[PDB]
Amino acid sequence: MKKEKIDLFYGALLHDIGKVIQRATGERKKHALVGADWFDEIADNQVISDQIRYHMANYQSDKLGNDHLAYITYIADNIASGVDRRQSNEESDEDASAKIWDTYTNQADIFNVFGAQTDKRYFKPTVLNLKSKPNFASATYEPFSKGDYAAIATRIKNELAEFEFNQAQIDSLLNLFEAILSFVPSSTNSKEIADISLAEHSRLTAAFALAIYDYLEDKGRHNYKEDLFTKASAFYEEEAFLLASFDLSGIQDFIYNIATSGAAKQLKARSLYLDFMSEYIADSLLDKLGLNRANLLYVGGGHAYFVLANTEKTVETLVQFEKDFNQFLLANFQTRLYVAFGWGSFAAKDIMSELNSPESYRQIYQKASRMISEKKISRYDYRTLMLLNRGGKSSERECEICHSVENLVSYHDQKVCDICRGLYQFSKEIAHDHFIITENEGLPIGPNACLKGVAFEKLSQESFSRVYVKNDYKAGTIKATHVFVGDYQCDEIHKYAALSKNEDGLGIKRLAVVRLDVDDLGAAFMAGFSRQGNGQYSTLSRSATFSRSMSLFFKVYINQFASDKKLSIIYAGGDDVFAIGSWQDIIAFTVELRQNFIKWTNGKLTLSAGIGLFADKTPISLMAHQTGELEEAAKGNEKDSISLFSSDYTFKFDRFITNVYDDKLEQIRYFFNHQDERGKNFIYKLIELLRNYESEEKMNVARLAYYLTRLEELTDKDERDKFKQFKKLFFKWYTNNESDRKEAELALLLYVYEIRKD
Amino acid sequence: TYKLYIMTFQNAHFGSGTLDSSKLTFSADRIFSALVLEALKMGKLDAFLAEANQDKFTLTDAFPFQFGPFLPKPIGYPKHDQIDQSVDVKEVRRQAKLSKKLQFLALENVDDYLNGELFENEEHAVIDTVTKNQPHKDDNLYQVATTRFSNDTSLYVIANESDLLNELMSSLQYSGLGGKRSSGFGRFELDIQNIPLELSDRLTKNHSDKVMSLTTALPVDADLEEAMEDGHYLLTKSSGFAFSHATNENYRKQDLYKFASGSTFSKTFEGQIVDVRPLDFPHAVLNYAKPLFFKLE
Amino acid sequence: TFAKIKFSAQIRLETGLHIGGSDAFAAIGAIDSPVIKDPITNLPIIPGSSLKGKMRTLLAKVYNEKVAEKPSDDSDILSRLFGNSKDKRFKMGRLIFRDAFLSNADELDSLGVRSYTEVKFENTIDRITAEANPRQIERAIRNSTFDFELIYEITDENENQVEEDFKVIRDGLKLLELDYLGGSGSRGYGKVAFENLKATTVFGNYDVKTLNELLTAEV
């Protein structure tokens, strides 16, 4: 895109850095002036300087030309905050501004305005780091401190001292901004709620400024002052934006359908490959329109949302891009993968909290969702279907993994297709942190574009169009797009069955697969904030801060939750979590993740989990299928449930945590490490009497009283004055109700799996 | 369009691409192939081929039968014209998920599903996997998936009343249906029942209103356009290895993409007994794609 | 003549049977070595793969006249009934096995049993230190019966070998009574008997009177 668009984007993104400098230094000057002065100390660019200086249109508008870009940026800021700041009169009286602005308040938690009203929490402003322990919001973190922002300002100045404001560096700046201001409020107005990070605020301002620029360029309207300042109320009514989206169907089937050995390496490679396919689709769509990742609201799980200019050229470019990528998917994966695009026209007034209404903010999503659904139902036209059904191929042999016929090759005396071959090659390249896009080298990720994972030292010897860096907040020497995925891996999957044994040989030789899902994520996105304030809390900014909160929780933070655990996180994006490892570590990881989530979201969103146990060398597709069934069963238990190893042990998460994992299983490892192998068999008998209580209810209870008082006689002298507790304990667990019987059954089964020697 | 053939299974395996995958119900190409093999083993293959060449022969995918015929969910009718409600988004997403999970509806309320009503799936079969080994080479540990039915639930198809088809079904009931038939899977007991008066009046083949398909049928090239513009459908592969008693080596047959059930259309079409055989092959491989339709309000 | 004969019988166990299923598949079983069960009724079953494999192995020591490293260089007698994947003319056999479900759970309930399966406790004694390591194995109860039902298909250009195939099947069944069904049967598991072993024609027409009397005579 043009140099003018580059300058406009940079001015829109850097307009509120003066707020950061003002909070760090404690100066009493206006934030725009401080930002412009600080920018002039580090870069000689007049256009960005005046954009930062005059991003409030009330500040010396008469000195600015009618075609000046700040009249765009200004109104874009009004779009990003969600509130028309002209009506609040906060820019015209300094004395009132000193009493309205509460500068001693940190960023509020996004969940303070989510769901039912609860206690308020506030985030301590911290620089995001991959290895850091979580930054949970807290009501104690409300007071503001200058020392926290001192390091923020120092690092921002150090990174922007030698920054080049050109095209190729643009993406890296966004990463830097995400690294620093994700826990700093955009506005400290007492009348407003500071749940919006300045991070996303500046990204949204830049995206909307680009959209308005494209719209005005299409319509030939270059009098920005007249259109966006004098007639801003009229511009707010014009349907100026397109809420676009794409959905890629076939991700689960493509990832999990592996039939032979080597399924682990393929499985992780396909997960990374498909995430990068989604990222490349988003970035190539943005490149074709001359936009950048600032317009990307959310990417992940095959779902991506964008805010685009509402022009016929945008609709055309969307249709032709969708057709080209559908042709590419038909050529490379036949009908397994299919991308469907979506869009809905909306105005500025549909997302400002003071002007919009809840059902319109729902309908702007619903239009794109409905159109995506209709395109998903009717996929291919007559010509494509006829081309698919031409037949006429005499192939004796098939692919051993994905059963494809196209382009079969021999490799390690197996017969793989071209895609399988590329994925086997890429499985050794996933260890690198740099992934380039070439024209014919690597896994075909797009039209005349292939993805290749290349080490850093060889990057200077490779030809590419775009480069991606995985799990890095540091702006490297190479201008690269930064992506974050959950990729923790302790050992190989085929070793996890044997790794469940301890140093003493204790533990069953089994492995576990956990599938976890966030409950009603889509309902949370659509109307999770609409419960409070009569729906005044339904705007784009808070929904997309919710999206970034979940993204940082599930693509960066799960890697820290999985630290020091013998497991691998295969897929972690959006709401679906897939992990595989030793069964004890899998259970502990699931419980820890649930607890950290319930602490992160204040309790307002729950998970549902399925944990399937399997033996060594179990084919991965079967493990994924059975664990998906267990996850569905856990969902069926009014959600907020965990299902362990079959549907019969479905519990509420809090019940499993409080009563089973940390209560009964503890009060069984205890007493039952005090009994020999002769008395560690009654553990099987107590299981049968719990599985057979509905037969012979009252003599099954008697059979218990007897069998419990026999374990307490087969013991050892005074070791038996210690098993006098089990009898009293397991008796009441047996006699209370069915829920505690099931909990004791699961606890006994867990203990049996822990102490097994075979 | 004449009878309501019922097959009561105990264990079955309908592979969807792998030995460890088993669907609840099979498709009509599988049962047509089973009939072809039983007819050729009988020796009366030519008579069955001549019967299939006629336009009277109609077949449909197996559907669940639990005290009444079931029909596949009509893909393409979640339409808001009968589901327009003022409920919250949580309930809208819950009902959308419930309808997406739904695959089969009872006959007595199919039109009720078109009135905006929401129904849940019923317990028909449990799909479980069993591990087996070979105790002479200690490396093969293969998993087989099953479709063990319960609660007096059977499968049913709709077809013309023919003595050849009746005896073919009777020989099928001791030969199994799909999967590892010589291992304890696929066998069934057959029953012949009359089509209910609320169903036979709806099974149609030739008119120009809204028709929901009952067979995994690929239309002829002449009328695919009408299925493209105003047709809602799902695409299903039909790949696999072509069984053959004439070749030592197993040949993969051509992958063919049909229209699933129940795909909704605005007009009926004609099916194909498509030759999916590989080149230079001695005998044909017939893939049956011929639709039986259901009228909608 | 296209007919199908159905050898139906009641397999009565005479010792505890341990066919054995996957730990997490046949339900999560606390015992170390669970037996395979029905996924709904949770009653032990005898899968048709078990019977087919054991019968093929037993008749592989009699009707093979040689040795085979794989179940592909087998005799024509075994290939024609069980099937051979690499032979064009026997890509599927004439025998169709079925799972044998529990058929006398009522009789077992009337006798007074509480479970249709039992836990047998064994141990191994070290040959040097003379220390005993215990072990548990799950078995199906002795007097449990299962519905055996095996079908043999007679087609055209196949009536010449029928009088042989009959004998083969009979021999196999006899060997299944003289050997163990799947499990640790060299140590006493899995001894079975066939009761009411008779064959009837169920599709088409065939003479099974001589076969029926020889089923009771030769067994």
DSSP-assigned letters across all residues of A185-248: BS--BSSS---SBHHHHHHHHHHHHHHHHHHHHHHT---HHIIIIITHHHHHHS--EEEEEEEE
Shortest Cα–Cα distance, A644 to chain C (Å):
10
Write out the two tokens for A425: 């090659």
Residues 6+ apart with CB under 8 A from A277: A248, A445, A446
- Round to whole Å and give the CA distance between A403 and B239: 9
Nearest chain B residue to A524, by CA? B90
Residues 6+ apart with CB under 8 A from B79: none
Q: Are C8 and C200 in contact (CB under 8 A)?
A: yes
**Chain C interface, mutation test: which of A509, A682, A688, most C Cβ atoms within 10 Å?**
A688
Compute how many other C-beta atoms are within 10 angstroms of the C-beta atom of residue A267.
26
Q: Cα A743 to the chain's mean position, in Å? A: 33
Nearest to A400 by CA among A391, A389, A387, A409: A409
What Cα–Cα distance (Å) separates residue C210 from each residue in A94, A522, A690, C218? 113, 71, 53, 11
- Round to whole Å and give the CA distance between C49 and C69: 20
In degrees and rounded to multiples of 5, residue A527 shows phi and psi of -140, 25
Nearest to A509 by CA among A681, A748, A754, A264: A754
Please indicate whether, in this complex, the C-beta atoms of A695 and C114 are within 8 angstroms of each other: yes
- In our burial notation (b when 16+ CB lie closer than 10 A, e otherwise), range A362-380 reads bbbbbbbbebbeebebbbb
- Round to whole Å and give the CA distance between A184 and A153: 12
Nearest chain C residue to B145, by CA? C25
Structural domain span for residue A539: 493-661
Write out the two tokens for B203: 């099974």
Residues 6+ apart with CB under 8 A from A142: A105, A106, A120, A122
Q: Are A450 and A440 in contact (CB under 8 A)?
A: yes
- Round to whole Å and give the CA distance between B116 and B233: 20
- Round to whole Å and give the CA distance between A481 and A435: 10
Write out the two tokens for B198: 């609320």
Query: Which residues of B sit within 8 Å Cβ distance of C?
Result: 10-11, 41-43, 126, 128-132, 137, 144, 146, 148, 150, 170-171, 174-176, 180-185, 187, 243-248, 250
* B183 closest CB neighbour out of C49, C86, C91: C49
Write out the two tokens for C58: 């037993």
Tell the residue number behind the tokens 């988003």, with chain if given.
Answer: A282
- Round to whole Å and give the CA distance between A526 and A498: 45
What Cα–Cα distance (Å) separates residue B57 from each residue in B41, B45, B46, C108? 21, 15, 15, 50
Local structure of A533: helix, strand or coil: helix
- Look at chain C and count its residues: 219
Write out the two tokens for A100: 């309205």
Which residues from chain C sit within 8 angstroms of residue B11, using beta carbons?
A: 99
Which residues from chain A sit within 8 angstroms of residue B228, using beta carbons?
A: 378, 381-382, 385
> Amino acid identity of C76?
D
Beta strand extents in A252-398 (DSSP E only): 296-300, 303-309, 338-346
Local structure of B155: helix, strand or coil: strand
Contacts 24+ apart (CB under 8 A), A59-67: A59/A30, A59/A32, A59/A91, A61/A225, A61/A229, A64/A225, A65/A225, A66/A222, A66/A223, A66/A224, A66/A225, A66/A226, A67/A222, A67/A223, A67/A224
Please indicate whether, in this complex, the C-beta atoms of C40 and B41 are within 8 angstroms of each other: no
**Pairing state between β B125-126 and B286-289:** unpaired
Put simply, whether A677 touches C (Cβ < 8 Å) is yes
- Round to whole Å and give the CA distance between A42 and A167: 18
What Cα–Cα distance (Å) separates residue A79 from each residue in A45, A355, A552, C214? 25, 12, 24, 93
In degrees and rounded to multiples of 5, residue B91 shows phi and psi of -70, -35
- Round to whole Å and give the CA distance between A306 and A294: 9
Shortest Cα–Cα distance, B146 to chain C (Å):
10
Residues 6+ apart with CB under 8 A from A136: A121, A599, A600
Write out the two tokens for A575: 């709401």
Write out the two tokens for A130: 């991959």
Tell the residue number behind the tokens 């341990």, with chain if given.
Answer: C18
Prior bond of B262 cis (ω within 30°) = yes
- Round to whole Å and give the CA distance between C63 and C59: 6
Q: What radius of gyration do chain A's Cα atoms show? A: 29
Put simply, whether B95 touches A (Cβ < 8 Å) is no
Residue A730 burial (C-beta neighbours within 10 Å; 0-12, 13-18, 19+): buried
- Look at chain B and count its residues: 297
- Round to whole Å and give the CA distance between C178 and C161: 25
DSSP of B28-82: HHHHHHHHHHHHHHHT-HHHHHHHHHSSS------EEESSSBEEE--BT---TTT
Which parts of B147-232 fold into alpha helices (H)?
163-172, 197-200, 224-229
Beta strand extents in chain B (DSSP E only): 6-9, 63-65, 70-72, 104-106, 125-126, 129-133, 141-145, 148-149, 154-156, 188-191, 203-204, 211-213, 235-237, 240-242, 251-253, 257-259, 264-265, 272-275, 286-289, 293-295
Compute how many other C-beta atoms are within 10 angstroms of the C-beta atom of residue A434.
23
Experimental method: cryo-EM
In degrees and rounded to multiples of 5, residue A601 shows phi and psi of -100, 15
Nearest to B71 by CA among B111, B117, B115: B111
- Round to whole Å and give the CA distance between A609 and A644: 8
Tell the residue number behind the tokens 């390591």, with chain if given.
Answer: C133
Query: Which resolution, in Å, applies to this structure?
Result: 2.7
What Cα–Cα distance (Å) separates residue A444 from each residue in A254, A430, A447? 15, 16, 8
Please indicate whether, in this complex, the C-beta atoms of A748 and C30 are within 8 angstroms of each other: yes
Tell the residue number behind the tokens 């190409």, with chain if given.
Answer: B29
Q: What radius of gyration do chain C's Cα atoms show? A: 19
Determine the Cα angle at B147 with ends B143 and B148, to 5°: 110
Q: Cα B238 to the chain's mean position, in Å? A: 12
Put simply, whether B141 touches A (Cβ < 8 Å) is yes
Which residues from chain A sit within 8 angstroms of residue C27, using beta carbons?
A: 646
Local structure of B296: helix, strand or coil: coil
Tell the residue number behind the tokens 């009761």, with chain if given.
Answer: C195
- Round to whole Å and give the CA distance between B13 and A752: 34
**Chain C interface, mutation test: which of B182, B190, B241, B243, most C Cβ atoms within 10 Å?**
B182
Which residues from chain C sit within 8 angstroms of residue A676, using beta carbons?
A: none
Query: Which residues of C sit within 8 Å Cβ distance of A?
Result: 22-24, 27-28, 30-32, 114-115, 119, 121, 134, 136
Tell the residue number behind the tokens 């008469």, with chain if given.
Answer: A62
Q: Are A296 and A244 in contact (CB under 8 A)?
A: no
Which helix (H) or strand (E) element contains residue C135? strand C132-140
Write out the two tokens for A152: 């923020």
Write out the two tokens for C116: 């249709």
Local structure of A510: helix, strand or coil: coil
Shortest Cα–Cα distance, C174 to chain A (Å):
36
Residues 6+ apart with CB under 8 A from B1: B58, B158, B159, B160, B195, B200, B203, B205, B292
Which residues from chain B sit within 8 angstroms of residue C92, using beta carbons?
A: 182, 243
Shortest Cα–Cα distance, A392 to chain B (Å):
7
- Round to whole Å and give the CA distance between B124 and A362: 37
Put simply, whether A683 touches B (Cβ < 8 Å) is no
How many Cα atoms sit within 13 Å of A254 on the Cβ side? 24
In degrees and rounded to multiples of 5, residue A100 shows phi and psi of -85, -40
